[PDB]
Amino acid sequence: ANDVNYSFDEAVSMQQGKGIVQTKEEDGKFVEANNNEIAKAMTISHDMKYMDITEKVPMSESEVNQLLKGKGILENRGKVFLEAQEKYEVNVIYLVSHALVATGNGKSELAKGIKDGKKRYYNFFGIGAFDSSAVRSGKSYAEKEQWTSPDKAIIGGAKFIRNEYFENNQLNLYQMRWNPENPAQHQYASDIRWADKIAKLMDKSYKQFGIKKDDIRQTYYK
Ligand SMILES: CC(=O)N[C@@H]1[C@@H](O[C@H](C)C(=O)O)[C@H](O[C@@H]2O[C@H](CO)[C@@H](O)[C@H](O)[C@H]2NC(C)=O)[C@@H](CO)O[C@H]1O
Ligand SMILES: [Cl-]
Ligand SMILES: [Cl-]
Numbered sequence: 001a002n003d004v005n006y007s008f009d010e011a012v013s014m015q016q017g018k019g020i021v022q023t024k025e026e027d028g029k030f031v032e033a034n035n036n037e038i039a040k041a042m043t044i045s046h047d048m049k050y051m052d053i054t055e056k057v058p059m060s061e062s063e064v065n066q067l068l069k070g071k072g073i074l075e076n077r078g079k080v081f082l083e084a085q086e087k088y089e090v091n092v093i094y095l096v097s098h099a100l101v102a103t104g105n106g107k108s109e110l111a112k113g114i115k116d117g118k119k120r121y122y123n124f125f126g127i128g129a130f131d132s133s134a135v136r137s138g139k140s141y142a143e144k145e146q147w148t149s150p151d152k153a154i155i156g157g158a159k160f161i162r163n164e165y166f167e168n169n170q171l172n173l174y175q176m177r178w179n180p181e182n183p184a185q186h187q188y189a190s191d192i193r194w195a196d197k198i199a200k201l202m203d204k205s206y207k208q209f210g211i212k213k214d215d216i217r218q219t220y221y222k
């Protein structure tokens, strides 16, 4: 179980490698992050981003629906978020928080899906290519997996996170974002503050319901 493979400096050089997309929000839009910004963002500073999200939390449907109140297309879908938690062993507070970041609090125009013929495809976790061209050409994960409803996008997103990240030993946000076992490969997002945004919402929800934190991992680099 020895997944500590690289020094921090080695990992930084890899994250700064040729063509690797690393972005930051500036003047209201996303721009490429510079080398210093990338390095700063990946620095370990001790802690929601380091918490194991493969452990479930005791949240009832009513509690999850409280989190989802006023969240657009996600409102009143707490039953299904909990279906996903139990089927796939995925922390439901994490799952909600991720969906809220990825969909603009459930209110973005993209969160309402992409039409293709008689069907509409939904994607609430930023998974794969998700625009009209990718849906038309058929080179969209959401279309491939037939996420033809919001509920199917909630379940399927969870299934994807479990099967592709959690089963790959990327068990916390930091690992999902920066894959320290194999730096610069298989990273969930280009936004250098992706983990911080999800972690902030998670912490608020933990403190709202009095939830206890699961295991926090400290060490990633030689
Ligand atoms: C969840 C997702 O789709 N995230 C995008 C991410 O893809 C990850 C790795 C995934 O499919 O789970 C994507 O990362 C690149 O993906 C291409 C394959 O499409 C790879 O060839 C690259 O090596 C990946 N790069 C890294 C650094 O992992 C990124 C690209 O910016 O976008 C994420 O939204
Ligand atoms: Cl480059
Ligand atoms: Cl990339």
Ligand SMILES: [Cl-]
Residues within 6 Å of the ligand: 060, 061, 062, 063
């Ligand atoms: Cl309930």
Ligand SMILES: [Cl-]
Residues within 6 Å of the ligand: 104, 107, 108, 109, 110
């Ligand atoms: Cl929008």
Ligand SMILES: [Cl-]
Residues within 6 Å of the ligand: 102, 125, 126, 127, 189
């Ligand atoms: Cl995302």
Ligand SMILES: [Cl-]
Residues within 6 Å of the ligand: 127, 128, 129, 130, 139, 140, 141, 142
């Ligand atoms: Cl895709």
Ligand SMILES: [Cl-]
Residues within 6 Å of the ligand: 127, 128, 129
């Ligand atoms: Cl992609």
Ligand SMILES: [Cl-]
Residues within 6 Å of the ligand: 149, 150, 151, 152
């Ligand atoms: Cl639905």
Ligand SMILES: [Cl-]
Residues within 6 Å of the ligand: 184, 185, 186, 187
């Ligand atoms: Cl990759």
Ligand SMILES: [Cl-]
Residues within 6 Å of the ligand: 168, 179, 182, 185, 186
């Ligand atoms: Cl990997």
Ligand SMILES: [Cl-]
Residues within 6 Å of the ligand: 041, 042, 049, 174, 177, 192, 195, 196
């Ligand atoms: Cl981070």
Ligand SMILES: [Cl-]
Residues within 6 Å of the ligand: 207
């Ligand atoms: Cl506090």
Ligand SMILES: [Cl-]
Residues within 6 Å of the ligand: 058, 210, 211, 212
């Ligand atoms: Cl608890």
Ligand SMILES: [Cl-]
Residues within 6 Å of the ligand: 044, 218, 219, 220, 221, 222
């Ligand atoms: Cl470390």
